[PDB]
Structures are given as C-alpha cells and as structure tokens.
Design a binder for this molecule. Structure first.
Ligand code: CE3
Ligand code: CE3
Ligand code: NI
Length: 341
C-alpha cells in the first residue's frame, strides 16, 4: 500500500513509488534519483511511464534494464508538461541525476518535492524563487540539531590533504574508498586527482560511473586495479579484516592502506563533541570516518525551509515512528514561529 506522502494531490502522479505494484490512479511515476530505497521495484518488466532526469534514465536503462519506451528523461530547469501538468526538475545537490520536482497544480497551488537533497543557499537564488511554493515534500533525514557536519568542501580538503601527505611520505601506500551506491564520487575522484592516479574499481562499478555524464571521467577511472593508487571497494569490506585481505592482493605491491568511509553525522555535547576526524588504526591499516553527507544538515534544512516559507510540510523520511513525527513537527513549528510565516 503506497503511503500518502508518495502521491501528489490533484494529479495522477506518484514520486518514488515503485514497490507497491500498480498504484491505483497513477498515470505517471516520477523517480527522483537512482538510490535503492527509491527505485525499489523497478525492473525490465515495468510497463508504465517513468519520469526522471537523463542520468537517472541512463541508470534505469543500463543497470535495471528498464525498457526504453517507458523511460521519459526530462531536462533540468525546463518547464515541461506531463499529463497536462507543468513540472520543473531542479538539481537536488544529492547524488548524480538526483532532482527535486516542482509541480504547478491546476488549481494554482505549487508543490516542491525535494526528493533527497542537501539544501544549499544557491537554491534560494534559483528559479525556485520565482513563484510561491505552497506545499513542501521534505527530505527530513537529519531533522534534529545534533546533525551537524562540515561542508563537502571542508571534508574533501581533509581527505585530499590526508591522502596526499600519506602517499607522499610513503609511495607504497594505497588509498581505498568504500561505496555501495552512486553518490559521493567527489571523494575518490578528488583524491585520485591530487595523486595523479586513476580510480580502480570493479566492472560493475565502472559501468555505473559510465552512466553519470561526468566530464573527462574516462581519464579518471579504470578496471585495471593494480595500476592505480586509489581503489573503490564495496562498503562492507571497509573493515580491518576486509582491508587486510585486500592488501594481500596485487602481488603485495602496497604496504599501507588508508581507507575512507562516510560516517560520523552526530555531534553535540551529548555525543561525540569533538568533530575532529582521527582514524581507527590496526597495524598498517587506517580507516578514516569522514562526515561527507549528501543530505541537509539540520541548519541547512532549517535555512532552506525558512526561506521557502511553505504553508504545509510533508516529511518523506523518518515518519515511521511517533517520536520522530512528533519531533519533526515541533521543529517545523519552531521554524515557522521564528521566521513569521
Ligand atoms: C573510523 O571507522 N568508522 C567505522 C569503521 O569503518 N570502523 C572500523 C572497523 O571496521 N573497525 C573494526 C573492525 O574491523 O572490526 C574495529 C575493531 O578492531 C580492533 C580495534 O581491535 C574497530 S572500529 C574499525 C564505521 C562507522 S559505521 C561502521 N559500520 N564502521
Ligand atoms: C506517514 O507514515 N507513513 C508510513 C510510515 O510509517 N512511514 C515510514 C518512513 O518514513 N519510512 C521510511 C523512511 O524513513 O525512509 C521507509 C523507508 O523506505 C525505504 C523503502 O527506504 C519505509 S516506510 C517508513 C507508511 C508506510 S507504508 C504506509 N502506507 N504508510
Ligand atoms: Ni538518496
């Protein structure tokens, strides 16, 4: 049974609702981005129109084998008509191909569905600013003040400087980055760039990255793993045992691994007050937990919502418990009272 927050009222549209069979009344299925929790259910046997970004369409065609006749890629920042309703797709600042959707309802209402997003002040000076938005379907992943983390730029600076120093001190070191989906490509691409290396990876991951329209990416990635100083591994292998086993590969041409894992999103006086990143180390293997996020921090989310001033907010994340629903509604009310909308 499709939850109500996945249906757009006054339309026959659903958003990220592919695991519920045939949704009654749905004439178009929007997919905000290619993450498993959102595309769950899509396959080569889906026979309804899917509306998405071009990059998401590339992944649907090449990774899930969705038939081309049902993939409807839409350009960003462009007014499009879908089944009699004007829509606009905007970059969500999440993972490649991820979009927010503006719906211009026939009754004059405007709805913004953020998909998954990392709110940024740049969104306030975009075409989002050119009309009132009445209802907001909000990515509330980190809707609590303890969710603080640096800008992606600060985190990438840390990772680049850490990896460059380690490999320049020890040219026999290897950098490993963990991955389980698309997104956070900047981490391993930036490290490989500063090291003059390509990123070695599995054929399956290589295929995935080939779908993302990343400029000059043939110059940055390879399936020849031992020829590179940066390797991508499945996230489940980013542990001392998994990295020890990997070090035994490639003829043992490396004697050190620095691994990067995205983690560490909670920081407050209650829990992990110090945000400074220090690796977990065992012998010649170090694992850096870096707070690289592709969701809004609490402050980023708050700023965006107080700028947008929506009349109604419908969370799309963390609404499975009464505690989380209640806390989120308290924050929305706080934000509304502070900003006066
Ligand atoms: C900075 O690292 N943050 C991590 C992570 O990758 N941690 C690591 C890992 O695996 N380790 C193991 C391990 O491999 O078991 C041990 C235990 O070994 C010792 C010290 O003797 C200690 S923590 C380290 C993390 C955050 S969320 C998650 N799933 N992992
Ligand atoms: C308003 O609450 N509506 C719910 C509900 O309990 N919602 C939830 C929420 O948020 N969840 C997330 C979440 O937090 O992300 C996922 C995760 O989903 C995936 C597949 O990633 C699964 S549903 C649970 C509901 C669920 S089924 C139904 N008819 N109503
Ligand atoms: Ni996502």
């Amino acid at each position: 049974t499709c939850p109500f927050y996945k249906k757009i009222p006054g339309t026959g549209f659903t958003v990220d609702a592919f695991q519920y069979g045939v949704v009654e009344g749905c004439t178009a299925y929007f997919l905000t981005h290619f993450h498993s929790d959102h595309y769950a259910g899509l396959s080569k046997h889906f026979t309804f129109p899917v509306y998405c970004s071009e990059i998401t369409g590339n992944l649907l065609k090449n990774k899930l084998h969705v038939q081309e006749q049902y993939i409807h890629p839409l350009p960003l920042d462009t007014e499009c008509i879908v089944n009699g309703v004007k829509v606009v797709l905007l970059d969500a600042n999440h993972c490649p191909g991820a979009v927010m959707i503006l719906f211009y309802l026939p009754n004059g209402t405007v709805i913004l569905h953020t998909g998954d997003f990392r709110a940024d002040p740049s969104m306030e000076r975009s075409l989002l600013a050119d009309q009132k938005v009445h209802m907001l379907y909000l990515d509330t992943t980190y809707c609590s003040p303890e969710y603080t983390f640096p800008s992606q730029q600060e985190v990438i600076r840390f990772a680049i400087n850490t990896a460059f120093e380690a490999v320049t001190l020890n040219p026999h070191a290897l950098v490993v980055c963990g991955t389980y989906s698309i997104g956070k490509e900047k981490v391993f691409l930036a490290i490989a760039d500063v090291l003059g290396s390509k990123v070695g990876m599995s054929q399956e991951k290589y295929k995935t990255l080939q779908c993302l329209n990343i400029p000059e990416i043939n110059s940055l990635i390879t399936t020849d793993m031992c020829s590179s100083l940066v390797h991508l591994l499945p996230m489940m292998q980013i542990n001392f045992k998994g990295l020890q086993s990997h070090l035994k590969k490639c003829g043992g041409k490396y004697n050190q691994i620095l691994a990067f894992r995205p983690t560490g999103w909670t920081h407050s006086n209650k829990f992990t007050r110090i945000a400074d990143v220090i690796p977990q180390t065992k012998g010649n293997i170090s694992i850096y937990g870096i707070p690289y996020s592709e969701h809004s921090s609490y402050l980023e989310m708050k700023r965006f919502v107080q700028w947008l001033k929506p009349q109604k907010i419908i969370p799309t994340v963390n609404v499975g418990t009464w505690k989380s629903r209640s806390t989120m509604e308290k924050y929305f009310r706080e934000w509304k009272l502070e900003a006066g909308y």
